[PDB]
Amino acid sequence: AKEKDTIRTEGVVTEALPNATFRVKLDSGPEILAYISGKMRMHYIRILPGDRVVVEITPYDPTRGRIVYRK
Amino acid sequence: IPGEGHNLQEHSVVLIRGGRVKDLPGVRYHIVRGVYDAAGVKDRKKSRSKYGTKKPKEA
RNA sequence: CGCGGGGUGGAGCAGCCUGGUAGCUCGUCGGGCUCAUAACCCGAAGGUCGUCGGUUCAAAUCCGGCCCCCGCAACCA
RNA sequence: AGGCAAGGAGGUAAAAAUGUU
RNA sequence: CCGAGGGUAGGGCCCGUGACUGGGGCGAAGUCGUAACAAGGUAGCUGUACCGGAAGGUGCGGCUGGAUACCUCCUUU
RNA sequence: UUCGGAUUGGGGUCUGCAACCCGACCCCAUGAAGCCGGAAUCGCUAGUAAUCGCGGAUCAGCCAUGCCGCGGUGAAUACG
RNA sequence: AGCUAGUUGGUGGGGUAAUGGCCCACCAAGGCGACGACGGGUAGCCGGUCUGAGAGGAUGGCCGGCCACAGGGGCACUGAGACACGGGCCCCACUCCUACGGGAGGCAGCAGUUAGGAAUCUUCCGCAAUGGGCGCAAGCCUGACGGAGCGACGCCGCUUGGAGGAAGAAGCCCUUCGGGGUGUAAACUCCUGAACCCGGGACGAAACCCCCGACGAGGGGACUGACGGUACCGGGGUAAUAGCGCCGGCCAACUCCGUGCCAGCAGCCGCGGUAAUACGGAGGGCGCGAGCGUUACCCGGAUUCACUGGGCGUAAAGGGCGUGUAGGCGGCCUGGGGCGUCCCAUGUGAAAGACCACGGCUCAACCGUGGGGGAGCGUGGGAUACGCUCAGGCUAGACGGUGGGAGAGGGUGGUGGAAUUCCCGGAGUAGCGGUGAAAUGCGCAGAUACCGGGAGGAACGCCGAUGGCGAAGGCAGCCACCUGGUCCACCCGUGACGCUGAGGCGCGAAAGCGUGGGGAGCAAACCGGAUUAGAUACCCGGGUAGUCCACGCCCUAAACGAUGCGCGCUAGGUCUCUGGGUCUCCUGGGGGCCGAAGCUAACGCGUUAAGCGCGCCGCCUGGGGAGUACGGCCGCAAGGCUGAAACUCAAAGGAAUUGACGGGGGCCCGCACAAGCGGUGGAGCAUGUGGUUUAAUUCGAAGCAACGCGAAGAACCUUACCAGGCCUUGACAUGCUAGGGAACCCGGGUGAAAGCCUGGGGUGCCCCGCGAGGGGAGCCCUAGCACAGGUGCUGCAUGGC
Ligand SMILES: [Mg+2]
Ligand SMILES: [Mg+2]
Ligand SMILES: [Mg+2]
Ligand SMILES: [Mg+2]
Ligand SMILES: [Mg+2]
Ligand SMILES: [Mg+2]
Ligand SMILES: [Mg+2]
Ligand SMILES: [Mg+2]
Ligand SMILES: [Mg+2]
Ligand SMILES: [Mg+2]
Ligand SMILES: [Mg+2]
Ligand SMILES: [Mg+2]
Ligand SMILES: [Mg+2]
Ligand SMILES: [Mg+2]
Ligand SMILES: [Mg+2]
Ligand SMILES: [Mg+2]
Ligand SMILES: [Mg+2]
Ligand SMILES: [Mg+2]
Ligand SMILES: [Mg+2]
Ligand SMILES: [Mg+2]
Ligand SMILES: [Mg+2]
Ligand SMILES: [Mg+2]
Ligand SMILES: [Mg+2]
Ligand SMILES: [Mg+2]
Ligand SMILES: [Mg+2]
Ligand SMILES: [Mg+2]
Ligand SMILES: [Mg+2]
Ligand SMILES: [Mg+2]
Ligand SMILES: [Mg+2]
Ligand SMILES: [Mg+2]
Ligand SMILES: [Mg+2]
Ligand SMILES: [Mg+2]
Ligand SMILES: [Mg+2]
Ligand SMILES: [Mg+2]
Ligand SMILES: [Mg+2]
Ligand SMILES: [Mg+2]
Ligand SMILES: [Mg+2]
Ligand SMILES: [Mg+2]
Ligand SMILES: [Mg+2]
Ligand SMILES: [Mg+2]
Ligand SMILES: [Mg+2]
Ligand SMILES: [Mg+2]
C-alpha cells in the first residue's frame, strides 16, 4: 500500500548529534529528532548545523523525522 | 507492531505475543494484529494470519 | 597647554637604567616541507629607534625644545 | 703486525596538527 | 494451668511506593583530546599511591604478552 | 663600454581580401635593466654535459627563442 | 555457620488402642552440625508423563496410591475409625437478615454466576449398568458413576469424487513474442453415491424378586434402559467445505511488477539507499491438510555442568606459596573375616501406562486378555579375584643413621671501601648546571671544577652468568654466630610411617597505614621553567610524603614457567652448575637449549612434558556488566577477600596467514645525495599558467606524472567565446506526403558580409503520339513530417588511446 501520509516539511538544523541524528528547527514549528537519509550518507553529503534540510515526518509521531534532501 | 501501518493509538487495548526484534533495543515483544483494538492489516493477501486479516472475500 | 613616562622596522613591544650592541613577537614576499593547509624551518626586506641639537671618542641609549601620545593633575571653591 | 673479533665507550637530530565529497 | 489470638515495646525479613541518589549497555557524522595498536612517536602491561576535564600521568616494585643494530675511541685475542 | 640588446619614433619590404587590435622582415635613430643573481633548486657518468649552428614538420605568412631531428667542438668528477 | 532449652537423656506419673519429650514434675547436661544442622526460597509426593541412543533432564495435567486442607486459625466431642468438607464450639475476616439485643452462612461437590485472567464447558438426562450406604426385603437415596451437550482442545478415522478427457479452451501470468505455464486441471461424457429421507433397530440385563429344591447347591419364570429411535443393517438418494505457512542460507520452493535503508520482514545470518530469488502484491512453486502457523514452557541438538563425555601454558579458567586437620586415595607377600562386590534361589517391585503377542469396537485410536521384563530393596545360601578389615611378614615408597658437599637461604651482631651530599680548611675564577634547543636554578657573600679532613645516611661496582639458593615472595660488600632446607656416597637402621589437601595456622614484592627514630641520594604530590593550538606530561630544576630501620598492621600482583602438587613410564644429543666414581668417561641431583614418539587450535611442549597414566585438590562454563553491587568477614583507614544478577550485545577471544601499514631493522639500487661542470631563482624579453579585467578573454590539463601542455602554426579561417545581422529538414545523411517548377548558368537591388528580395537566359534524358499534349528518371524549390545537428553536460557509466 505504502501509506504516503509522509510530511515533507523543511527545517534549518539547530544541532548535531551522533549517527547523523539532528535536532532541526522547522519552518513548520517544532525541533524534533530527525535522523539522516541513507542516500545522503551514501553520497557523503555532510549535514552541518545551520542548514535548510527537508525533514520528512510520520503522522504516528512527528517528534521523530527523517532528513531527505541536501540542505 | 508489525504490519504496514497501525490503527493503534494511545489508550486502546492490545495483545502481546513476545519474541525479540533484533534491530530494536529492549523490545522483546510483538504486538499481535487481530485481537482487541489491534485490528488487522488492510490489503495483506499473503501472510495474513500472522496479521489478523480475514479473507479477501471472492466472487 | 601644567606634569612625566613613552612613540622602534609595517603592528605590538624589548633595549632607555651601566651610553657603543637595534632585539623579540606578530605580519608580508620568496622558498623549503607535504596530498595539501599547515605548523614547522629557512631566508628576504624593514626601523628619521617620535623627533630637533646637545654631549661624548661614541648616542634609541644622556640633557633639553618640541610634535606629540597616553595620560594626571586643572582639585576644596 | 695483521686476522676475526670479545668487552666498555657516545652518537644515531625534535617534531608530527588536520581532512567535504 | 494449658491455650488461638489480641495488645505494648524491640528487631528480623518481604512486597508496594519512595523525595534523594548511584547508574550501565549499545549507538555510522556528537563534543575535547589521542591514551592504546607499529619503539603509536615517553615500550606497554601490571599492583598499589597521589594527582588531573578525560583518556590518564608520575612514583616504587614486578613482568616480558617489549622493540633493539650501526659508526668512532680505550683494554684484550 | 664597439659589452648588451630591451623599448620607442620614423621610413619601408613581403605574404595574404586584409597585418589597427594582432605578422614576419629590412633600414636608420633610440640604447633601458643587467657587472654571473638570496634561501633554494634542476640538469647531467662519454662523445655526455657545455657551447655552436643547420634542417624539418605544421605552414600563405608567421609571432618558433617552441618541438622533433642532425651534426661540429668537446669537457669535468664519481672517495663514497 | 553454628543451631537447640522440652532442647537431649533419665526416674516416676499423666495421656494414648499402643511406644515415645506426646505431655508434666524433678535430676542429669547433653543432642544435632560443613558426610550441610538451623535460616531463606521453591515444591504436595509418587506410579508415572514428556523427552532422550542411553545415562540423564524436565515434569507430576487426567487415571491409580498416599498425604494435607476444607474462608483463616484453634480445639475437642461423638464414635471402630475424625481432630471430622455439605457435624459442633470459640476467635478473626467477609457476606446476609435485624424490632440493633443478636443470629445465619462457606461451591477447593456437580452445574453455573462473577472476578481475575490469554484461557477452560451444560444452572443436561438417568438410577438402566457398575459401585456406595441403609434396610429381611421390596425399595429408598447416590451431580460416586453411566451418559449426552459445548470446544478441531488433543489423538485417530473419513468426506470435499473417481474414470476418461488437447501436443493442450478460455481466464490470468510470463515472454526471448517463436512460445511456455497454470494443467488433464477444467468444461464436457460415463460411474459412484458423503450428505439426506423412508423401513427395521439393539448389545449392554440378569441378577436382586417369586416358586420347586432345606430360605443351600441346583431348576424354571418374570420385571427391569439415561444413552436413543442413537449405533447399526436394508432400500432409496444429490458431485457435494479448502485452508494456512512458506518460498536468500539453514530449509523443500522462483519469477514479475510495485517499493527504493522508505514502507517493511526477521528465528539467526541479515535483506532493503532503482531490473531486491529476502519488503507489498501477482502468478508459479513447496510443505502440510480440516487443519496449518505463531507464541509460551520443556527436553533435545547442547559432550554448552561433560558419570557414559569436557577443560585449565596463550582462548574462560592453577589458588601466591608452605605446613596441616577432616575427608579422599594407597606398595609387595601370606592367611583369616566376608562389610563393599558377584552369583543363585526366593520374597517384593500393585493395577493402569511403557513392551511383545492375540482378541473386540467396520480399521485405528481406544479397550480387553495373556506373557515377559523392570532398576532398586529384603531374606537364605554361597564365591573370595579386587576394595575394606583384622593378624603375620617383606624392603622397591617414605623416613632415619654414618661420611661429606654446594650454596646472594633466613636472622642477629659487627665491620670495608668507592660514590654522593653536607660542613670546615686550602687553592682557585666566571661561570657551572642543563638541553633537541633553552630557560628557571645555583655562583663574586667566590660557585663549578681540584686537593685535605670530617659528618653521616643509604646502597653494595668488578666477580656476575645463559650461574647458585629458596616453597614462594625473594636473596648478592665482607666477617662471625645461631639456624632452615637440600644433595650425594654407604645401603647400615625403621617397616608403608605414604600422596594430596576443604577448612585452619604460617609466610608473603612493592606501594600503603600507625607509633617512634632516621634522613645522603632519589623522589609522587607540589612550586618552578620550558615544550605545546592546550601540558594537569614526556625534558630540566628544586622539593614533601615515602623510600631506610624498629615494633605493629596491611596481603595485593604479569605473587609468571601466564603451566597445582605427587609418583611411575616413554629416543637422543648438547652446554651448564653441583656431588660420588674404577677421573679422556660413567653415575646421581639441579639449570638451559635443540629435538624421537606422542600431544596440541597452532605457537609450541617435549625425562625440568603441555606425552602416556593414576592419585588428590583448586578453579572454568559467552563478552560486557564487574571483580562492581548487596550481604558477610578481616582491616586503624586505604581496601581486600567472598562473589552476583537485572540489563545488554553476536560477538569478546586465541593461534597462525595473506596483505597492508609502521615517526621498526638490514641488504641492495638510481645522477638520489656526495664528487663535478653548467645552469634556473635575480635583468629584459619569448612564451604557457594562476589570478584579475573584460562583451568575451574558448574549453580542458593540477605534486612528481598541470604549466614552450592538448594548440605540430589563433590576423580572417582556425574557433569551440562575445556583439551584430541573418537562416531554418536546416552546412551534411538516408527517406515521406506531395505540389508546381525542375539539369544548368548569367545578372540586379540592399548589405560589413552572410543573407533576403528579384529578373532572365534554361531544360535536354526515357519516351508514346501525325500533332496538341502526358507521365516517370536524374536534378533542383516550398510546406508539414521521419529526421538531422550539438566542440552540449557527465572520463566516479565507458571503449579506444
Ligand atoms: Mg509524502
Ligand atoms: Mg606511548
Ligand atoms: Mg514415662
Ligand atoms: Mg515462607
Ligand atoms: Mg505451591
Ligand atoms: Mg488422584
Ligand atoms: Mg478452615
Ligand atoms: Mg474459596
Ligand atoms: Mg472415643
Ligand atoms: Mg464429614
Ligand atoms: Mg476478564
Ligand atoms: Mg433432575
Ligand atoms: Mg419404606
Ligand atoms: Mg436427593
Ligand atoms: Mg463424567
Ligand atoms: Mg513473511
Ligand atoms: Mg526468508
Ligand atoms: Mg515475497
Ligand atoms: Mg569427563
Ligand atoms: Mg570445551
Ligand atoms: Mg587468560
Ligand atoms: Mg589423612
Ligand atoms: Mg590395599
Ligand atoms: Mg504393572
Ligand atoms: Mg668552601
Ligand atoms: Mg631451585
Ligand atoms: Mg636396609
Ligand atoms: Mg628390620
Ligand atoms: Mg605392619
Ligand atoms: Mg612508616
Ligand atoms: Mg601520622
Ligand atoms: Mg635531586
Ligand atoms: Mg609543569
Ligand atoms: Mg622531575
Ligand atoms: Mg620470580
Ligand atoms: Mg598446594
Ligand atoms: Mg613428530
Ligand atoms: Mg623443544
Ligand atoms: Mg592443553
Ligand atoms: Mg582489586
Ligand atoms: Mg562491602
Ligand atoms: Mg596474533
Q: DSSP secondary structure string, chain A?
A: ------EEEEEEEEEE-GGGEEEEEESSS-EEEEEPPHHHHHTT----SS-EEEEEE-SS-TTEEEE-S--
CA of residue A60 to ligand 32 center, whole Å: 72
Name the pairing type of β-strands A52-57 and A7-16: antiparallel
Q: How far is CA A53 from CA A17, A27, B8, in A?
A: 15, 10, 30
Mark yes or no for CB contact B43/A1 under 8 Å: yes
Phi and psi at A12, nearest 5°, equal -85, 130
For A39, phi and psi rounded to 5 degrees?
A: -55, -50
Chain A CB within 8 Å of residue B48 CB: no
Q: How was this structure determined?
A: cryo-EM
Residue numbers in B near A2 (CB within 8 A) = 4
Q: A1 CB near a chain B CB, below 8 Å?
A: yes
From the list A69, A63, A55, the residue with the least C-alpha distance to A6 is A55
CA separation (Å) from B1 to A26, A48, A70, B37? 29, 34, 31, 12
User: For residues A5 and A59, is the Cβ–Cβ distance under 8 A?
Assistant: yes
| Superfamily the domain A1-71 falls into | Nucleic acid-binding proteins (2.40.50.140)
